[PDB]
Design an enzyme around this catalytic site. Structure first.
Site, PDB file in Angstrom:
ATOM      1  CD  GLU A  52      -3.076  -0.830   2.235  1.00 46.55           C
ATOM      2  OE1 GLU A  52      -2.775  -0.228   3.324  1.00 46.55           O
ATOM      3  OE2 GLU A  52      -4.222  -1.301   1.955  1.00 46.55           O
ATOM      4  CD  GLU A 108      -4.179  -5.800   2.668  1.00 48.30           C
ATOM      5  OE1 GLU A 108      -4.872  -4.902   3.257  1.00 48.30           O
ATOM      6  OE2 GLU A 108      -2.924  -5.712   2.502  1.00 48.30           O
ATOM      7  CD1 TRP A 146      -7.983  -0.257   9.473  1.00 43.64           C
ATOM      8  CD2 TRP A 146      -9.343   1.417   8.861  1.00 43.64           C
ATOM      9  NE1 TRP A 146      -8.612  -0.622   8.315  1.00 43.64           N
ATOM     10  CE2 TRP A 146      -9.442   0.382   7.911  1.00 43.64           C
ATOM     11  CE3 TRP A 146     -10.061   2.596   8.646  1.00 43.64           C
ATOM     12  CZ2 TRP A 146     -10.267   0.464   6.794  1.00 43.64           C
ATOM     13  CZ3 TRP A 146     -10.877   2.686   7.533  1.00 43.64           C
ATOM     14  CH2 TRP A 146     -10.969   1.634   6.619  1.00 43.64           C
TER      15      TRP A 146
END
Lengths: 691, 691
Positions: B160, B318, B326
């Site tokens: 990422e 994912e 989060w």
């Protein structure tokens, strides 16, 4: 971990013991002629103790190595000749400008590397060697000068450590945190395992690679074991500082000494229970919570203070006659609340009642903070009330209140400063849940059912109680786990809530199903959580229960219930949620005891409505009276029971009627009927009776 | 701009192709005995691929120039012997403490000059020469060591990019941004004109006077051309880094390779369409949006992923079994949603389905992030569901799903990362309007009308579609303008909204009336805007339309309509506003095509209610069925059409009934009636049929 021997400020020679009454006194803000009026008003008010020199460093040491004590000698003589005792400060709470100008390395540093400047107070680093040297120097000069002064009865060491300087990210704190970790863990491998550093490439080769939790980009997620340890370290570093100042005073001028805490439902700057082991007597600073929580939260805070003190008498160092200066909206006290608030602390075990401050400042950052002598002067409702309270405390001491202790409750509500810290991480199930609210909600729900709980720190003897509450107690260490399991199996009665026992003291999760160390005690297994709120359209924001209560913010997903347990209440919900008919409240038989599990946040109101059923199931007796939640009943007794006092506080905005079971000593917005042995207590009123 | 040749991770020797199934796997967080249970559970779950070593730098290179690969060799052998393939990381996603301690110049710097510290992840500068050297070194050591390993099927390069280090304001980024601008514009005069620097004395004499958009006092207005270029530069700088890592791996150990994107309706950290040209195959990370948007937004994101992939199969690297860690409130998944969410991505063209992560962490910042093996262990609803999904994906691959492609829709919804960036400036007509919401609102409104749109990046072939949506597409370059004009004139059917075509690619306004480059296509002229909200008492907060819908946030002031156009809907308002009877929705004949203009924000609900009229006017056919919006229908087919699959997802909280037009293969919270060839789909359910 031993407590120090208990010591208490003693009377001036020739005086008898009294409930100490007074406040912070700052004659250094006023011309000296004002001091003679201050002394005459204090006598009128029944003031017998004041706390002096707390922020007086810039006058005591006006330049480096020059001392000016004559002003303070003169005001202490005036007070003492008038029969008023002095709680003398170290003077070290905040450094003068000459010192920080010469030594910028004293100033604490924020998480981005920005240095905190002078202009307010307490802008010094807990781990600064040079600030320590300056502080110990003043302590010694003060102690040497006042060691034989007959009017100084105690030391007030610094002021509210950590209110402003809890966190320092300097190079000093970097070095001190490395040493702390080494002294806690022994090896870097032990630190790596504790903090879970295999995650995100954080594994360290040696102690020099331990850094503070500085700026990591706002919104990003700090290592939680490291953040938890940071808060423990920060409290310890200030404790070390306190102990050094204390020791420096006591070596020259041994007197009872304390430092003032900030115990309140939501304040966890320091581990105050830990700190309580290093004071000679516990002293607290508490200011009212605005609105409906005002009375209950203050009673709860004074109750927790008493728990920290292990039921020894304690000292209310500060509270307010009316508004404070430091909220966005500084609400005033209502009529009667000055007297009521003071007696609330007294009821919960204080043998001293003191305010911030004696005379309202006319300039500076707290000029809008209420005082005993307002801007308006002695011709004021506040000053009249202050005088009335003074006469009240003289009466109660005449009647034997001193040294009596808050009576043991049937119920201990457990409080853990460290569990709060653990719940403060930014990557928990939900930011809406913290440890600190649940114990307060229990205190209030239990009062609604006619029961005044004790609030007991986790280190304290909660396992000696008839019943115990674990309220969102996120950490259960191996030790606490053992204490819980043994307490219940031997016949204890336990209440456990959601967000209890998720982790151990390293912030490692207990595996196998929550709560992972005590699943068999509570006889349930939780496989996941269902946080709730209104963050986006269509989010699940509540869950009804079939006992007429409503959950918010958080519910547990309970997937099995032990054969020794049964369901007291179940959720009702839309089918697709998975919650319809799911267990919400359970009770398990474990050994000779029982444990109830409350799998959601029900609030004060939900708990209060759920408790009758649970109190019955756990065999905990309460009044049958319908009006049982209207007043808080708080009792103090001596060891024999010859001096037994009951304080009755109206918690409502109706008139409360009570029985009078002894001699009425003090009444505020309350009327006694001798005939019927009854009393009507107005809103905000209180009656005190001796049995 | 060419795409790379498509490559896909191939089976281990002796295995047949499968829908890859698995997750990130972090054995380095656990004692080695756990690894043998991990492998046995993975076999039970039908897991056939895992992604390893993503954040393992501190174990792979524990000190500078020392490599420890034996642990990773051992776990890769265990996986491979069990028939599980490895997607191996470079390991370079986040640097170890020894590296940043030795080289603080690696750390990225914020807009105020504050350096991002270790303690989380990805704290490195995209333009750091020394970090690049360290990263390429590890890439090469990894590639050399694993080049002949028979169980490594692909490379997972870093992780990422830009999630945390998108923006760096260091001296490195200062130099690199100057070079970028020179390589884009050629002369400083061209930069001055692009950025409009004659305004506010910003004109530069040479490239050295280009500085990053650092701190300018909070609330002040940065040069918008410079900010837009900053975001393009920031994406390019990380792309350069990715391409260098990629190349370094492939030179030694050529295998299919990817880096994982964060494609979701509201994430525009990178120009993911641009990036898609440099991966061998597209891989995405998507986590559910809480509440009512959950299903539709995930379908839309997977749809956009497929558009980026130009309808080639793509890899779901994912997603989550349940809650993430989060968000401020980490909501759980409801029963059935684990299976449903996975098949949603599958429906939209994924040939791999993977989670973050295999085993839930017991410590560290993501311990509260759900996993395939929860804290609760394999005896959990999550693990059962994971096993059920595994069997589902085996069945679908047996039935020929692999390599089929998402079918072409009648409608292309255009998405531009750069238009989003342009709408992010702080001195636009209103901060309530951004590009990204409008395309999502269209996707959902079209689904409500029985139509599954394609979501096509602006560079992609949207001009080959029967109809096209320009949804708050703020930028129209000269090129895009030409494509739009030609598309409609030749017979295309176009929808254009408010906030479309305001500027060109330099953020210069198209003059003469909005939308300035295509006024004649839409046959309207807008002279100004009327933003709306509730910022102060008496602000205009809505505008009714005469087709029973309501505008919020923004409306256009249309002052003329072409003779080839007509008004479909008009505002109704208080006279003094100027809006009463003003045009709101129009349709224009332009060449052989038509263009509808929607002059206000109508939301999902307003668009859904406005569309029947507009679909009819533009000749776009949909179902006559009343229940047409209840389920999302998603189709995949091979090129011939011999393998044609339909996925039916309930979008509602009612039971949906559907026809069964072939063989039912997979059902989740759905019941088929063979007799009537019908199925009832529960909320959160899905049925998959082969035609």
């Amino acid at each position: 971990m031993e407590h120090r021997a208990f010591k208490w400020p003693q009377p001036l020679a020739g005086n008898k013991p009294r409930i100490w009454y007074g406040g912070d006194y700052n004659p250094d803000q006023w011309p000296e002629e004002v001091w003679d009026e201050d002394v005459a008003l204090m006598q009128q008010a029944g003031v017998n103790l004041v706390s002096v020199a707390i922020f007086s460093w810039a006058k005591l040491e006006p330049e480096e190595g020059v001392y000016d004590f004559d002003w303070l000698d003169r005001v202490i003589d005036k007070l003492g000749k008038a029969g008023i005792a002095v709680d003398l400060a170290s003077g070290t709470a905040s450094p003068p400008m000459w010192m920080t100008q010469a030594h910028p390395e004293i100033l604490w540093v924020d998480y981005r590397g920005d240095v905190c400047q002078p202009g307010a107070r307490q802008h010094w680093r807990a781990t600064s060697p040079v600030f320590l040297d300056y502080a110990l120097n003043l302590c010694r000069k003060m102690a040497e000068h006042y060691k034989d002064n007959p009017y100084v009865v105690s030391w007030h060491v610094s002021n509210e450590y950590g209110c402003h300087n809890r966190f320092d990210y300097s190079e000093d704190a970097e070095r001190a945190f490395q040493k702390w970790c080494e002294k806690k863990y022994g090896t870097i491998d032990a630190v790596n395992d504790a903090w879970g550093t295999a995650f995100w490439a954080q594994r360290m080769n040696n102690f020099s690679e331990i850094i503070p939790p500085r700026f990591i980009g706002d919104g990003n997620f700090m290592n939680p074991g490291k953040l938890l340890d940071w808060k423990r370290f920060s409290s310890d570093a200030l404790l070390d500082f306190y102990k050094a100042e204390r020791d420096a005073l006591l070596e020259i001028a041994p007197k009872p000494q304390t430092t003032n805490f900030m115990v309140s439902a939501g304040c966890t700057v320091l581990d105050y229970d830990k700190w309580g082991h290093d004071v000679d007597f516990v002293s607290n600073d508490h200011y009212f919570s605005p609105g409906e929580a005002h009375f209950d939260e203050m009673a709860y805070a004074a109750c927790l203070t008493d728990g920290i003190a292990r039921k020894n008498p304690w000292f209310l160092m500060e509270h307010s006659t009316s508004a404070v200066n430091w909220r966005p909206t500084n609400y005033r006290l209502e009529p009667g609340e000055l007297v009521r608030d003071s007696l609330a602390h007294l009821a919960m075990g204080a043998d001293a009642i003191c305010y911030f401050q004696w005379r309202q400042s006319k300039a500076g950052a707290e000029k809008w903070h209420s005082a005993m002598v307002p801007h308006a002067g002695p011709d004021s409702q506040i000053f009249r009330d202050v005088c009335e309270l003074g006469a009240d405390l003289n009466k109660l001491a005449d009647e034997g209140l001193l040294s009596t202790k808050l009576v043991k409750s049937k119920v201990a509500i457990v409080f853990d400063y460290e569990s709060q810290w653990a719940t403060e991480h930014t990557a928990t199930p939900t930011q809406e849940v913290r440890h600190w609210t649940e114990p307060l909600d229990w205190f209030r729900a239990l009062a609604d059912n006619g029961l005044t709980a004790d609030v007991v720190p986790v280190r304290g003897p909660w396992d000696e109680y008839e019943a115990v509450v674990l309220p969102s107690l996120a950490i259960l260490s191996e030790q606490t786990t053992r204490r819980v399991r043994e307490y219940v199996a031997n016949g204890g009665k336990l209440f456990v809530t959601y967000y209890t026992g998720l982790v151990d003291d390293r912030d490692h999760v207990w595996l196998g199903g929550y709560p992972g160390s005590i699943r068999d005690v509570v006889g349930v297994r939780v496989e996941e959580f269902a946080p709730m709120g209104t963050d986006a359209p269509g989010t699940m924001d509540h869950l009804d229960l079939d006992n007429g209560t409503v959950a918010h913010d958080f519910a547990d997903v309970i997937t099995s219930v032990a054969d020794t347990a049964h369901v007291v209440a179940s959720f009702k919900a839309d089918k697709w949620t998975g919650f319809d008919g799911a267990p919400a409240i359970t009770v398990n038989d474990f050994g000779d005891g029982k444990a109830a599990y409350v799998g959601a946040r029900l609030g004060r109101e939900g708990l209060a409505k759920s408790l009758p059923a649970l109190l019955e199931e756990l065999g905990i007796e309460t009044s049958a009276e319908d009006d049982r939640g209207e007043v808080l009943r708080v009792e103090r007794a001596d060891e024999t029971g010859e001096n037994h006092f009951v304080f009755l506080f109206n918690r409502t905005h109706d008139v409360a009627v009570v029985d009078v079971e002894g001699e009425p000593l003090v009444a505020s917005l309350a009327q006694v009927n001798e005939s019927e042995h009854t009393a009507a207590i107005q809103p905000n009123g209180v009656l005190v009776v001796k049995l």
